[PDB]
Design a protein around this ligand. Structure first.
Ligand SMILES: *O=P([O])([O])OP([O])(=O)O[C][C]1O[C]([N+]2=[C]N([C])C3=C2N=C([N])[N]C3=O)[C]([O])[C]1[O]
Lengths: 17, 750, 732, 336, 100, 7
RNA sequence: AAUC
RNA sequence: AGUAGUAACAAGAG
RNA sequence: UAUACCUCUGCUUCUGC
């Protein structure tokens, strides 16, 4: 992935029910 | 039509975040034209305007008109005031000794011990200094030499001993001499044989003449200050005057400043003498503590402050009192030493620059009016502005064309000691056990006062007390420029705070260009400025990479050294184009020889010559780095590594770079204007010393590296060395019987 | 025959009257004054003067020599040089074209031993050449302004010591009084001479280049997890404010530097793991995937024999033997028996000041070492008792006694401090009080011995004492003797226990010091942000709240309080003072419930407090939670979250709907209710407190946190939110 | 001793606004002579390269960029003649190399100039330069703009299709060694503008955790383009791109040079004090003052006959009015 | 002493502070709106927005400035060979003849 | 590669 | 686990 | 004239 | 006076801490 792509960012902590 | 407004950025981004865009540092700084006499006389008048209600007396020494504001009547208005009460200073100083235990005697010791070790040559490392002998500004190194040679005639050889103490002992003694003789070179004709029609030629030889001056004249010259105007001073509409000091005073200032510097380092609430990241690191912690210590459920307020008429108010007689308090435990010889510098400033004389130029517009003529001939002309011919000034100057004006300026600190020089007096005010912290607590920071004239109290109504009452406290020390807070706000953001010495000191790229922007040392040096400096700005002043890699682009541009046009393949026409470019064709390893060629620019973000720290060395041709690298090339010359330890830089705030500090010594590391021709003036004679004087020094360095190679020590003769040293060298070379068998006897014969004559 | 020439050139000079008098009257001291003499004024606009000068015909100045005459007067109709001599050089002036000519068609000089002379620079390139680059990460970076070494040295020395070493190499005969320093660096001098043997380069250049690779270049720079010189030289490419880049510098790295980073790595892991339920499970997870430059933490802990408490704890957790080997500069100890406990004391010293020092209690034994010499040491709370040592060098035995006395923290040692010592830095920073006292008494040791005491020597088989002079004497130092001869398991909550149930180390035994690494610590784990600093974690956490503010705010308003205890907010807890962490949760959980139940919601305040509600709550005696004006966090006076107001860490702008988290601005436009813009903060500012009317002059001045806590339900009060916003609040 | 000539007082002029609005605008012509660079290895350099492809070209393809490159290249050659040919009168052309969208080197000529005798000793010593410059602008339209200029009709051109009349603006001007040098170093207008906006790209890149350059300018999958308050429309605010907001600052930084003097410095300095006091009110940090009218006299005595100062004074009063309206939203917060 | 001096000092000496409110910030430069004064003239060294360059597509090589200025005028010969002065605007102290 | 636009 |  | 802006340059000297 | 349509000069007619 290229630094300009949004998919470059790390799989961040997401909230779930 | 859509009407663009640039300020509308401030709607989206806050002022501090984008403060860089409020600094026009792509533009030209203000310069001064013609005379600075009108600017100096203004200062002379304004200095006495704030001290006029003090005590006026006539100096029995000089015979001048003196003014003493100290322990004068207290002000009844917000106009600047030099009327500082001695007790209120001594109390604030006492309060500092209580808060910081045994700092004064500790600082005094360190300075006193340093003074003993300090050599006379310490007075060489200075800028343009006033030379009393010729009554013109000259380099410190020369201005010192002229005084030593002059003192030898009047019989004062304390300089020869090596220490600064005996040389300073000579300076105060030289006032007692009834007449002070000094050399004044005067031309003489001399026939010399030649191949002319009349086989000879006339060569005007210099001859030194013994010229004397009276006791009074020398005393004044010793207390004289030479005035100019501040050029290239940013963020200012109208101009202002500055002054240079003599070689006499400069000796004693160095110690007193070093003394205050020792105090300032240890003081918490001082921006000096710390700098760069160290400065930020301190102010950040100071701000964090001054923030988080405040009473809960109250208000912490930061006064973004500044003092107007700093130098014009502060009196030397207060600075004298400061040293006497600081040197209380130190011995009696040191007390009297530190007391001189202020005593000299207390009875200082101001030189009023060049003068005023008068012109007839119809006739189309002009002529400078020297300062001694200011009242030769009826004052109707001077314009309103100057006419008013010259009348106000009259009661302070001397016949020789100078002004008695007993009050104020025209030149300044006392920055560290002037900071301390400011800190002393910040040390008080409260008056009348009221419900507030103040504490600030000090960088000479610049200050930032924090106030923690119940409510803002109390805070302002607390600030009002600081203002009235500072008036008794001689510190006048600028009601105009100074402003207040709740803690979180403030300004202190062009550094902008907003929950942390914000990046301000525009302040360092002028430094990015070609510094103007030479091709090999400027390249290193150029990249070293770029890499250091990525670190400290937050320049992103994109802007950083562009800063490399924009450098090579300015570099290639300035040194007319465009790429070899590029067909840009020029005298040099013609030989560059041949080198490009001749050379195989063209990537090995430097940018100054029309080679490619291979620099990027990573390799800024590596010299250009080192980066390309492996890629160079074997012939080219030989030429570029020829050991005995004619371009480089006799390199001085400072000449290789260090070079001057002028940032738009503080004094001219010399930064150091990393560059390889090659053909490009050249020097420029000397200013040849001297050839047409009578100063010519100094050229011979220089080349004479040059021979001696260059021959001394041939005998002692370490002289270039580490300063030679010895109170004995410079010839005596050279004799004994060359004697041994010859003897050992003979016994070893490097020297023959033919040469040894000739050597011992020549040395026999000496 | 150089000698003959110099004498004959001295003869020619002395025939001149001016030169004769100068050489007679000028001293060797004054040489430094006549050298700096010239007609040349200082150019106070060199940038301009150069650009101007470059547009002249002959700007440069050649040095009068045969090599200057090798240049032709003109080339292909180009004036290279002029006949007219320069005032300075006394040689033909020339154009910049003359330089370009020389480099093209000039004579080919001798570049033999150039790489050996300019070694320091070539190494700097060699490090970048052999280096490997990692990956760029975008996200906040807290930068500390520490005094670091700019360039790596060959062998470090003070200015004086190096200057003499340089003299011995280049200028032997001038050198002067031979110091011991010569014999210490004798091996370097010999080596440098052989390398700088067959070179034509000027000595002044060699001296300068040597001075670089000996004298230290230490200055303050903003850094973040890399203090090693070979990193600092690349600091521009390492990290910015809002980005970071992994970089492995090539060549060699030091063992000490690896050991330095190895500690902070463990200390960071433990400090974070402590808060999580089953710390060991989390410590083991990270520790495995933690990397120091390139070498993993396990490989470092296995390879290096040494460290601190924190290193051993992790060593055990990974499954490695624990080296209980404490180091105090030159002194290297190893625990035999006893266990001490650190306690901050207000210790008074000889010069007359007081300093907070962490004193060690209980009786202990250690196996000391200092170079060639070895020994065993015993001590108690602020006293030295017994010190056994072997015979080796006089200076190694001399230094070992000084270190052990300072280590013991004996009240006789602190009484010996009679001079000047700096516990505070030039920039108002803190310097390790114990590591400062060690440096003081190492140089000035005359006070230490005198101020300690003396008594008779021991009278045994091989036991014979030594005096101040370090010789077998009768009067030995009070409690000093010389002689002739020289598995564990870890708990859930990170504690090292013997087979007997005896604990030797715990999580409360590691240092609370947060300090920069020398090498670069890289965590090969998707949850690496958790090991970050206070301002890094504070910012990163609040970003996760905003990243899921839609789903979080929704399920909370329905009822479900399952977010309160969410993975994200665990890392945030480890930068709360683990002492009021529960009380903060108590306050926050109450004020949050008071917003969704009462229906006086404020999305900005929801985002502000939700991270504080992970810690199991702790209420007051009478059921009510604790009340606060601001919530304090680890390190710095900057770090706090003002509840009534905005803070340096967290602030909200209603006007623009802009949220500023540690300088970085986010927008809350399209995530706020229309009615919410009106809703006062007074309702969601104190737990079990809601706004009634406006400031009533009758009720009196604004009440403190204490005065608000101790009020019976259904009592009216005055609170000030932020300057000029009075409110009338009543207790529910 | 003759009375000193003081800068006379002027009023606001639309041509300064018009200059701003036009210099900001995009064109199809790249002027900047940005040289080569070392090859990218470190991923920071690769990001640095991409970031430029957006940042540089946004300036390069604008009017101000060419005007800047003209001044530089002219002041470069003008200083070279001034030292080389001191005694000689020389006809210097107003050269500029430009590249179009297709990529063709179009050498431009904006007119001819004449440098007088240049025996420049002091830095401030003046060398009179006489400018003859081409233009499509009829000077009769805005008469009060060109008191200093002397104009002749010299033909016509069909650049668009309408017969656009070519004029020749002739003026006796003057420069010195300093201004000519500071002119050669006017490329650094890029850096002051590019850093300020790369900072905002970094700031936003931190929050989203990837290079937000591409996203800020145009936008991507997740993120929409950044927008800034940029100008007015008959007394009602308008928003504009990041690309425009970049160029508006770059233009300002060029104007800082083109109208750079003691009047600008003095104003810029004293006007910050007021800009901060405004930020205090915007932050609601209850700011206090000791003498405002005195602090104003400092700002107001710097406004005389500098076009940029006089227009900045107007723009400041315009912006102050808009911020003064926004305040009304806050004063009615937490008062129920 | 400081206590004794601040006691005896006149109350007239003070910072006389006031809290800043938006409607205190009067617009800077009152005179710039007055129409009595003359419109500020263009005083830049070169022409900026009004400028007009004559396009001469190069052979991808660098040429002398005189030669360039020549070839550029060779293309636009109609303007280069316009010897008839058609004056439009004149500067107060300037010469139509000398300039042309 | 990038190519800027405007109204 | 710092000082220089 | 013009640059420029509280005072200069628009060449100086033998 | 004169050589002098010649000769020299371009930060060195005051640039501080
Ligand atoms: O780094 P610390 O904050 O833990 O403090 P310091 O300077 O003492 O660290 C040096 C090392 O030495 C150990 N030490 C110090 N003393 C005087 C004692 C000990 N350890 C024990 N068991 N007993 C002592 O009396 C510190 O633990 C540290 O490792």
């Amino acid at each position: 992935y290229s630094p300009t792509s949004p998919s470059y960012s790390p799989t961040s902590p997401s909230y779930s029910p | 039509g859509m009407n663009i407004n640039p300020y509308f950025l401030f709607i989206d981004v806050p002022i501090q975040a984008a403060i860089s865009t409020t600094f026009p540092y792509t533009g030209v700084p203000p310069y001064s034209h013609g005379t600075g006499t009108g600017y100096t006389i203004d200062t002379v008048i304004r200095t006495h305007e704030y001290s006029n209600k003090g005590k006026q007396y006539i100096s029995d020494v000089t015979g001048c008109t003196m003014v003493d504001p100290t322990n004068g009547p207290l002000p009844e208005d917000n106009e600047p005031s030099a009327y500082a009460q001695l007790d209120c200073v001594l109390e604030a100083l006492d309060r500092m000794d209580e808060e910081h235990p045994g700092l004064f005697q500790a600082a005094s010791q360190n300075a006193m011990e340093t003074l003993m070790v300090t050599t006379v040559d310490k007075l060489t490392q200075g800028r343009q200094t006033f030379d009393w002998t010729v009554c013109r500004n000259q380099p410190a190194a020369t201005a010192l030499n002229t005084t030593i040679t002059s003192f030898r005639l009047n019989d004062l050889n304390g300089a020869d001993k090596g220490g600064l103490i005996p040389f300073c002992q000579d300076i105060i003694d030289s006032l007692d001499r009834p007449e002070m003789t000094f050399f004044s070179v005067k031309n003489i004709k001399k026939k010399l044989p030649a191949k002319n029609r009349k086989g000879f030629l006339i060569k005007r030889i210099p001859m030194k003449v013994k010229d004397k001056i009276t006791k009074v004249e020398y005393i004044k010259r010793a207390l004289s200050l030479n005035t100019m105007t501040k050029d290239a001073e940013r963020g200012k509409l109208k101009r202002r005057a500055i002054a240079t000091a003599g070689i006499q005073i400069r000796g004693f200032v160095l110690v007193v400043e070093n003394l205050a510097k020792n105090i300032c380092e240890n003081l918490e609430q001082s921006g000096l003498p710390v700098g760069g990241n160290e400065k930020k690191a301190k102010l950040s912690n100071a701000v964090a503590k001054m923030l988080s210590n405040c009473p809960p459920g109250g208000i912490s307020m930061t006064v973004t402050g500044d003092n107007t008429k700093w130098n014009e108010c502060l009196n030397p007689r207060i600075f004298l009192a400061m040293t006497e308090r600081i040197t209380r435990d130190s011995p009696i010889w040191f007390r009297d030493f530190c007391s001189i510098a202020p005593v000299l400033f207390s009875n200082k004389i101001a030189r009023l620059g060049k003068g005023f130029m008068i012109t007839s517009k119809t006739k189309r003529l002009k002529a400078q009016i020297p300062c001694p001939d200011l009242f030769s002309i009826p004052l109707e011919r001077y314009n309103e502005e100057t006419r008013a000034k010259l009348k106000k100057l009259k009661p302070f004006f001397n016949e020789e064309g100078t002004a008695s300026l007993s009050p104020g600190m025209m030149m300044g020089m006392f920055n560290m000691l002037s900071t301390v007096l400011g800190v002393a005010a910040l040390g008080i912290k409260n008056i009348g056990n009221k419900e507030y607590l103040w504490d600030g920071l000090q960088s000479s004239d610049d200050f930032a006062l924090f106030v923690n109290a119940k409510d803002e109504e109390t805070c302002m009452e607390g600030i009002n007390d600081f203002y009235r406290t500072c008036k008794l020390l001689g510190i006048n807070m600028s009601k105009k420029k100074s402003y207040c706000n709740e803690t979180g953001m403030f300004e202190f010495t062009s550094m902008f705070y907003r929950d942390g000191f914000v990046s301000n790229f525009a302040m360092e922007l002028p430094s990015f260009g070609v510094a103007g040392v030479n091709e090999s040096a400027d390249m290193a400096i150029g990249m070293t400025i770029i890499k250091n700005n990525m670190i400290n002043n937050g320049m992103g890699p994109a802007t950083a990479q562009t800063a490399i682009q924009l450098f090579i541009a300015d570099y290639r046009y300035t040194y007319k050294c465009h790429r070899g393949d590029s067909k840009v026409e020029g005298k040099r470019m013609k030989i560059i184009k041949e080198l490009w064709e001749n050379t195989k390893g063209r990537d090995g060629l430097l940018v100054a020889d029309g080679g490619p620019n291979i620099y990027n973000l990573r390799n800024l720290h590596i010299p250009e010559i080192v980066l390309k060395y492996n890629l160079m041709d074997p012939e080219y690298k030989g030429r570029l780095l020829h050991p005995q090339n004619p371009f480089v010359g006799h390199l001085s330890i400072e000449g290789i590594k260090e070079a001057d830089i002028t940032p738009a705030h503080g004094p001219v500090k010399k930064m150091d770079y990393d560059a390889v010594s090659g053909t490009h590391s050249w020097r420029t021709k000397r200013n040849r204007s001297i050839l047409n003036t009578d100063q010519r004679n100094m050229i011979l004087e220089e080349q004479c010393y040059a021979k001696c020094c260059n021959l001394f360095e041939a005998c002692f190679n370490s002289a270039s590296y580490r300063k030679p020590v010895g109170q004995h003769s410079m010839l005596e040293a050279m004799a004994h060395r060359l004697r041994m060298d010859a003897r050992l070379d003979y016994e070893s068998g490097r020297m023959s019987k033919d040469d040894f006897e000739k050597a011992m014969a020549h040395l026999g004559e000496i | 025959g150089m000698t003959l020439a110099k004498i004959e050139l001295l003869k020619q000079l002395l025939r001149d009257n001016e030169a004769k008098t100068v050489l007679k009257q000028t001293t060797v001291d004054q040489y430094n004054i006549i050298r700096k003499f010239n007609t040349s004024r200082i150019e106070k606009n060199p940038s301009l003067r150069m650009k101007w000068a470059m547009c002249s015909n002959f700007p440069l100045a050649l040095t009068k020599g045969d090599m200057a005459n090798r240049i032709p007067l003109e080339y292909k109709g180009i004036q290279l040089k002029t006949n007219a001599e320069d005032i300075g050089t006394k040689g033909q002036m020339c154009s910049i074209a003359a330089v370009t000519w020389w480099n093209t068609y000039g004579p080919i000089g001798d570049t033999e031993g150039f790489e050996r002379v300019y070694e320091s620079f070539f190494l700097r390139k060699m490090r970048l050449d052999n280096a490997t680059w990692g990956r760029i990460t975008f996200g906040p970076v807290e930068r500390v302004r520490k005094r670091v070494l700019l360039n790596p040295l060959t062998k470090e020395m003070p200015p004086d010591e190096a200057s003499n070493v340089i003299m011995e190499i280049l200028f032997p005969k001038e050198a002067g009084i031979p110091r011991e320093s010569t014999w210490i660096h004798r091996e370097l001098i010999k080596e440098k001479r052989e390398k700088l043997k067959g070179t034509m380069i000027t000595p002044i250049v060699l001296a300068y280049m040597l001075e670089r690779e000996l004298v230290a270049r230490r200055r303050f720079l903003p850094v973040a997890g890399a203090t090693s010189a070979e990193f600092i030289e690349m600091l521009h490419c390492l990290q910015g404010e809002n980005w970071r880049q992994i970089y492995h510098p090539g060549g060699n790295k030091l063992t000490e530097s690896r050991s330095q980073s190895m500690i902070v790595a463990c200390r960071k892991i433990i400090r974070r793991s402590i808060v999580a339920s089953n710390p060991l499970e989390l410590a083991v997870e990270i520790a495995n995937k933690t990397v120091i430059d390139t070498e993993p933490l396990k490989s470092c802990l296995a390879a290096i024999d040494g460290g601190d408490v924190a290193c051993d704890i992790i060593r055990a957790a990974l499954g490695l033997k624990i080296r209980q080997r404490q180091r105090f500069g030159r002194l290297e100890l190893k625990r035999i028996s006893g266990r001490g406990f650190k306690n901050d004391e207000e210790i008074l010293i000889g010069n007359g000041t007081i300093q907070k020092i962490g004193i060690w209690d209980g009786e202990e034994e250690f196996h000391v070492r200092c170079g060639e010499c070895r020994g065993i040491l015993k001590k108690s709370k602020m006293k030295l008792e017994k010190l056994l040592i072997n015979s080796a060098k006089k200076e190694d035995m001399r230094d070992l006694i000084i270190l052990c006395m300072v280590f013991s923290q004996d009240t006789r040692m602190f009484q010996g401090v009679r001079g000047e010592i700096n516990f505070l830095n030039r920039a108002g920073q803190l310097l390790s009080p114990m590591y400062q006292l060690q440096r003081y008494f190492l140089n000035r040791s005359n006070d230490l011995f005198d101020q300690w005491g003396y008594e008779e020597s021991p009278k045994a088989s091989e036991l014979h004492g030594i005096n101040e002079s370090m010789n077998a004497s009768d009067y030995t130092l009070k409690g000093v003797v010389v002689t002739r001869n020289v598995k564990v398991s870890i708990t859930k909550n990170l504690s090292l226990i013997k087979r007997t149930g005896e604990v030797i180390m715990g999580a409360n035994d590691v240092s609370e010091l947060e300090s920069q690494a020398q090498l670069m610590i890289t965590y090969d784990t998707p949850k690496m942000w958790e090991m970050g600093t206070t301002k890094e974690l504070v910012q990163n956490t609040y970003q996760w709240v905003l990243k899921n503010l839609v789903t979080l705010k929704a399920q909370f308003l329905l009822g479900k309080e399952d977010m309160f205890q969410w993975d994200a907010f665990e890392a945030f807890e480890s930068i709360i003072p683990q002492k009021m962490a529960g009380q903060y949760s108590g306050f926050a959980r109450a004020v949050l419930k008071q917003m969704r139940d009462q229906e006086v919601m404020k999305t900005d305040q929801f985002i502000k407090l939700l991270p504080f509600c992970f810690s199991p709550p702790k209420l007051r005696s009478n059921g009510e939670p604790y009340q606060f004006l601001k919530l304090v966090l680890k390190g710095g006076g900057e770090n706090f979250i003002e509840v009534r107001k905005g803070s340096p860490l967290f602030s909200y702008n209603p006007q623009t709907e802009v949220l500023t988290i540690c300088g970085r601005m986010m927008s809350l436009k399209g995530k706020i209710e229309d009615e919410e813009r009106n809703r006062s903060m007074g309702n969601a500012v104190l737990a079990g407190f809601l706004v009634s009317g406006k400031y009533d002059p009758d009720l009196g001045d604004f009440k403190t946190i204490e005065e608000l806590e101790k009020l019976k339900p259904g009592e009216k009060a005055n609170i000030l939110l932020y300057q000029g916003k009075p409110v009338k609040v009543v207790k529910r | 001793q003759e009375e000193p000539k003081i800068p006379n007082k002027c009023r606001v002029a639309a041509w300064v606004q018009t200059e701003m609005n036009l210099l900001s605008t995009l064109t199809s012509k790249r002027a900047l002579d940005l040289p080569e660079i070392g090859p990218d290895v470190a991923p920071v350099e690769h990001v640095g390269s991409e970031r430029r492809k957006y940042f540089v070209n946004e300036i390069n393809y604008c009017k101000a960029s060419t005007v800047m490159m003209k001044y530089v290249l002219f002041h470069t050659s003008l200083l070279n003649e001034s030292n080389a040919s001191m005694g000689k009168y020389k006809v210097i052309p107003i050269t500029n190399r430009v590249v179009n969208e297709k990529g063709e080197s179009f050498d431009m000529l904006y007119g001819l100039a004449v440098k007088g005798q240049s025996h420049l000793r002091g830095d401030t010593d003046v060398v009179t330069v006489v400018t003859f410059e081409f233009s499509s602008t009829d000077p009769r339209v805005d008469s009060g703009k060109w008191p200093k200029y002397t104009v002749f009709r010299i033909g016509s051109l069909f650049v668009s299709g309408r017969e656009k009349s070519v004029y020749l603006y002739c003026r006796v001007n003057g420069t010195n060694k300093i201004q000519m040098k500071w002119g050669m170093e006017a490329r650094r207008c890029l850096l002051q503008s590019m850093q300020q906006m790369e900072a905002i790209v970094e700031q936003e890149s931190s929050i989203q955790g990837y290079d937000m350059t591409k996203a800020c300018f145009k936008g991507d999958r997740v993120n929409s383009p950044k927008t800034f308050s940029i100008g007015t429309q008959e007394g009602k605010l308008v928003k504009g791109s990041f690309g425009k907001a970049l160029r508006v600052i770059f233009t300002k930084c060029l104007m800082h040079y083109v109208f750079g003097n003691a009047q600008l410095e003095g104003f810029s300095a004293e006007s910050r004090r007021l800009l901060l006091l405004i930020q205090a009110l915007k932050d609601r940090k209850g700011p206090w003052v000791f003498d405002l009218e005195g602090m104003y006299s400092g700002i107001e005595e710097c406004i005389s006959n500098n076009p940029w100062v006089i227009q900045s004074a107007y723009w400041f009063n315009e912006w102050l009015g808009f911020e003064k309206e926004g305040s009304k939203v806050l004063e009615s917060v937490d008062e129920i | 002493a400081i206590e004794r001096n601040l006691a005896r000092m006149s109350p007239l000496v003070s910072v006389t502070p006031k809290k800043l409110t938006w409607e205190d910030l009067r617009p800077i430069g009152p005179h710039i709106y007055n129409h009595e004064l003359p419109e500020v003239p263009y005083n830049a060294f070169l022409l900026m927005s009004d400028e007009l360059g004559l396009a001469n597509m190069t052979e991808g090589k660098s040429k002398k400035p005189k030669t360039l200025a020549k070839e550029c005028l060779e293309k636009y010969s109609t303007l280069r060979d316009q010897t008839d002065p058609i004056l439009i605007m004149k500067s107060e102290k300037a010469n139509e003849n000398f300039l042309w």
